[PDB]
């Protein structure tokens, strides 16, 4: 048979809803464990970062924004400036939305 709670009803209701007892379980706490990774980076000088970009372009020609940022650990604005200074992204090709080296710099 079912089990009937024989205690005081308020004692049972204390855990319910609008309560002091905040949750202490760690189940499905993806929000706290995915917000603890913070990216902090500074303006490394332009020649070093463009040499790094050329090295990664020599390693593989097509790179997105997120993979390049996690590979170089640089701010998005400065990396975007160093990208569109010397490279461009594909718009309509099969490798679209991926930055590739300019044909002027492709020979080197």
């Amino acid at each position: 048979r079912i089990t009937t709670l024989d205690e005081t009803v308020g004692v049972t209701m204390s855990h319910t809803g609008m309560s002091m007892r905040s949750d202490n379980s760690n189940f499905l706490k993806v929000g706290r464990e995915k917000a603890k990774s913070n990216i902090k980076s500074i303006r490394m000088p332009k020649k070093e970062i463009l040499d790094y970009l050329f090295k990664l372009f020599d390693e593989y020609d097509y790179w997105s924004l997120k993979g390049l940022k996690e590979r170089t650990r640089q701010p998005e604005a400065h990396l975007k400036e160093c990208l569109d200074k010397v490279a461009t992204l594909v718009k309509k090709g099969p490798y679209a939305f991926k930055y590739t080296l300019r044909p002027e710099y492709k020979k080197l």
Partner: protein, 42 residues
């Protein structure tokens, strides 16, 4: 994740309250009626 938000007790509570208050039975009617307290035999 908040299990307080996950389990909406108002679903069960309002469903039972609505299906017993009105006779509309679901989501046939007249299942629940006001008790005839007119005489004891009634």
């Amino acid at each position: 994740f908040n299990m307080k938000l996950a389990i909406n007790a108002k679903t069960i509570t309002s469903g039972l309250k609505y299906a017993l208050a009105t006779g509309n039975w679901g989501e046939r009617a007249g299942v629940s009626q006001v008790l005839n307290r007119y005489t004891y035999s009634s």
